[PDB]
From a paper:
MutLs, with a few exceptions, are endonucleases that incise the error-containing (i.e., newly synthesized) strand of the mismatched duplex. Prokaryotic [name] endonucleases and the endonuclease subunits of eukaryotic [name] homologs include two domains: the N-terminal ATPase domain and the C-terminal endonuclease domain (CTD). The dimerization subdomain contains the metal-binding sites, in which multiple zinc ions are coordinated by the residues from highly conserved motifs: DQHAX2EX4E, ACR, and CPHGRP (underlined residues coordinate the zinc ions). Here, we solved the crystal structure of the endonuclease domain of [name] [name] in the manganese- or cadmium-bound form, revealing that these metals compete with zinc at the same sites.
In order to explore this possibility, we performed crystal structure analysis of the aqMutL CTD complexed with manganese ions. The aqMutL CTD, which is purified as the zinc-bound form, was incubated with the buffer solution containing 2 mM manganese ion at 70°C for 24 h. The protein was concentrated and crystallized in the presence of a 50 mM manganese ion. The crystal structure was solved with manganese single-wavelength anomalous dispersion phasing. Peaks of electron density in the anomalous diffraction map calculated from data collected at a wavelength of 1.8900 Å were clearly observed at the M1, M2, and M3 sites of the aqMutL CTD at 100% occupancy. The overall structure of the manganese-bound form was almost identical to that of the zinc-bound form; the root-mean-square deviation between the two structures was 0.1 Å. No peak of electron density in the anomalous diffraction map was observed around Asp351 of the DQHAX2EX4E motif. Thus, it was confirmed that manganese ions bind to the same sites of aqMutL as zinc ions. The electron density of the guanidino group of Arg406 was also missing in the manganese-bound form of the aqMutL CTD. Likewise, the position of the α4 helix, the structure of Arg406, and the quaternary structure of the manganese-bound form were the same as those in the zinc-bound form (respectively).
Numbering used by the authors:
A (entry chain A), B (entry chain A): 0, 325 to 425
The structure:
């Protein structure tokens, strides 16, 4: 993610939607917080058990915190178990489908 | 779209994001209103020129109206010029990427 981004909100109490000028990202809130905790604690079991789970509503402030920290992780791509932290769609795929330039 | 859906908001002042249990839809606000106006007026030039354009902010109420009407169109799929009204992503593609069942 570029430094300039827009948080669109939570989906299914599971993903944080955030976009920059290139992609829309669907960030798994559990995998992100597990990665945040794992880089601090260096213990994957502890990081997992203390992190938020899917199905929990998050406040706007909590969402802001997580996304800000995400950009500074050493590994913002995969959790300690190797699962992708996010799904991404290039914005151009959305624009081109409806016949718009991007 | 199924009758039960969740509007997630506007993106880039261009798309309305709305999901049901199967897909997340990115609905082009101009193409949707052009389709609404075209089915009423039966004039594609008039329908186009009176419809909202990309880049206009829409109120929550206006967004609700458009999405409610979208589901009742005779052709909710393509505008009178044949451009797809929306892009869609199966929710399972997002969930499966992060290792979740859906
Ligand atoms: Mn441990
Ligand atoms: Mn875990
Ligand atoms: Mn675990
Ligand atoms: Mn803050
Ligand atoms: Mn993990
Ligand atoms: Mn493409
Ligand atoms: Mn005319
Ligand atoms: Mn038009
Ligand atoms: Mn036109
Ligand atoms: Mn209303
Ligand atoms: Mn058209
Ligand atoms: Mn698939």
């Amino acid at each position: 993610m570029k430094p300039t981004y827009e948080i669109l909100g939570q989906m299914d109490e599971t993903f944080i939607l955030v976009k920059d000028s290139e992609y829309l990202y669907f960030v798994d809130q559990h995998l992100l917080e597990e990665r945040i905790n794992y880089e601090k604690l260096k213990d994957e079991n502890l990081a997992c058990r203390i992190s938020v789970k899917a199905g929990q509503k998050l406040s706007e402030e909590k969402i802001r915190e997580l996304i800000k920290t995400w950009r500074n992780l050493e590994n913002p791509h995969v959790c300690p178990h190797g699962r992708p932290i996010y799904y991404k769609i290039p914005l151009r795929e959305i624009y081109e489908k409806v016949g718009r330039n991007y």
